[PDB]
Amino acid sequence: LFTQIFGVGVKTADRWYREGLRTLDDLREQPQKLTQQQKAGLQHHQDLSTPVLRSDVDALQQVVEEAVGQALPGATVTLTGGFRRG
DNA sequence: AAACTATGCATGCTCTACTGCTTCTGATCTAGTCGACT
C-alpha cells in the first residue's frame, strides 16, 4: 500500500511501518513529514492507482507532439516503455 | 594710594565628531550520505 504512493520507496515505507503508521488515512493526519513528491502522490492517489489505457496514451502523444512541434520544428517523439512492448 | 574688576594665559578633564587599521560575524558556496525516481 505504501510503495504505490508516488515518491515513497521501500526505505520510507519501512520507516513508516516501524513508526506505527499502518493506514493511508494516518498519513494524511500528519502532513508535515512529507516532501513535495509524497504530498503530490498522496493527494492524487486514486487517480494514479487506476491503470492507464491506450486511448489516453494516444491523446497524450498527440498533445506532446503538438507541443514539441510548436516549440522546435522537426522534433521527433517515440513512445517507449511498456506500451512499446505491446 | 588702595581695592575691585576686565582681560588674558596655561593646564587638566570631558563630549563630540571624524579617519584609518584590524578582527569578528553574516552571507555565499562544494563534499559526504541517504533517499526518490527511472
The candidate with the shortest Cα–Cα distance to A56, out of A83, A74, A36, is A83
Q: Which of helix, strand or coil describes residue A13? A: helix
Three cell numbers at A79?
513512445
Distance CA A38, CA A7 (A): 5
Q: Find and list the nucleotides of strand B having atoms within 7 Å of a protein beta carbon.
A: 34-38
A78: which residues sit within 8 A by CB, 6+ positions away?
A: A84
Which nt is closest to the CA of A37, judged by C1'?
A: B36
Distance CA A72, CA A86 (A): 29
Number of H-type helices and E-type strands within chain A: 5, 0
The resolution of the experimental structure, rounded to one decimal in Å, is 2.8
Residue type, A47: D
The sign of the dihedral angle between the CA atoms of A22, A27, A32, A37 is positive
What are the two backbone dihedrals, phi and then psi, of residue A79, each rounded to the nearest 5 degrees? -85, 115
Place of cell 487517480: A47
Which nt is closest to the CA of A80, judged by C1'?
A: B38
**Residues in contact with strand B, defined as Cβ under 7 Å from any of its atoms:** A 6-13, 15, 37, 81
Distance CA A68, CA A7 (A): 27
A21: left (phi over 0), alpha (psi -120 to 50) or beta: beta
The candidate with the shortest Cα–Cα distance to A50, out of A85, A4, A3, A2, is A4
The candidate with the shortest Cα–Cα distance to A52, out of A64, A61, A39, is A61
* Number of residues that this document lists for chain A: 86
> CA A31 – C1' B2 distance (Å)?
104
Method: cryo-EM
Three cell numbers at A49?
492507482
